């Protein structure tokens, strides 16, 4: 967890990703590695 992501700019988000954020991967099990999509 965490290490498998945050490569470019993936931020860990609790549960579901925020509106302006896409779930490119998972930071953990529930925590997603939401990537900005601005």
Distance between the termini: 25 Å
Alpha-beta content class:
mainly beta
Helix content: under 10%
Radius of gyration: 9 Å
How many separate domains make up the residues? 1
Number of helices: 0
Disulfide bonds: 5-33, 12-27, 17-34
Subunit structure: Monomer.
Subcellular location: Secreted
GO cellular component, one term: extracellular region
Provide a short characterization of the protein structure.
It is classed as antibiotic. The chain has strands at residues 11-13, 21-26, 32-36.
What does this structure look like?
The chain contains no helices and three strands. With 38 residues, it is mostly beta strands. The chain has one domain (1-38). Strands 1-3-2 form a three-stranded antiparallel sheet, with no helix packed on it. The termini are far apart.
Q: What are the defining features of this structure?
A:
mainly beta; 3-stranded antiparallel β-sheet; 0% helix
How is the secondary structure organized here?
Blueprint: E1 11-13, E2 21-26, E3 32-36
Antiparallel strand pairs: 1-3, 2-3
Subunit structure: Monomer.
InterPro entries: Defensin_beta-like
Family: Belongs to the beta-defensin family.
């Amino acid at each position: 967890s965490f290490g498998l992501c945050r490569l470019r700019r993936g931020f860990c988000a609790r549960g579901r990703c925020r509106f302006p954020s896409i779930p490119i991967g998972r930071c953990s099990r529930f925590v997603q590695c939401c990537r900005r999509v601005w």
